[PDB]
């Protein structure tokens, strides 16, 4: 049923691109208030350059931020999609 479910032509070896980084911008944008606060802390737990430095507002540096840290958000979102089922 996999073929009828989707196919997802997804590249794992894509070079640092703004579209690449920005794909994750749209994921964080879809996530609710509870999630944004949580994820931002997980992502920024890696980079010191994290949002900008200021922790009051949330502005994701990902244009200038590393693709390695980019993938952290990917992991999170993939987790959020399958763990949207709360208890």
């Amino acid at each position: 049923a996999s073929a009828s479910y989707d196919s997802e032509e997804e590249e794992e070896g894509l070079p640092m691109s703004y579209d690449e980084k920005r794909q994750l911008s749209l994921d964080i944008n879809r996530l609710p208030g509870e999630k944004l606060g949580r994820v931002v802390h997980i992502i920024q737990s890696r980079e010191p350059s994290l949002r900008d430095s200021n922790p009051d507002e949330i502005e994701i540096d990902f244009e200038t931020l590393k693709p390695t840290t980019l993938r952290e958000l990917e992991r999170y979102v993939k987790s959020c999609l399958q763990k949207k089922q709360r208890k």
Partner: peptide, 12 residues
């Protein structure tokens, strides 16, 4: 930088 991924989660 160029195309901003600087989110600013528009919750409010």
């Amino acid at each position: 930088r160029s195309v901003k991924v600087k989110i600013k989660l528009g919750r409010k």
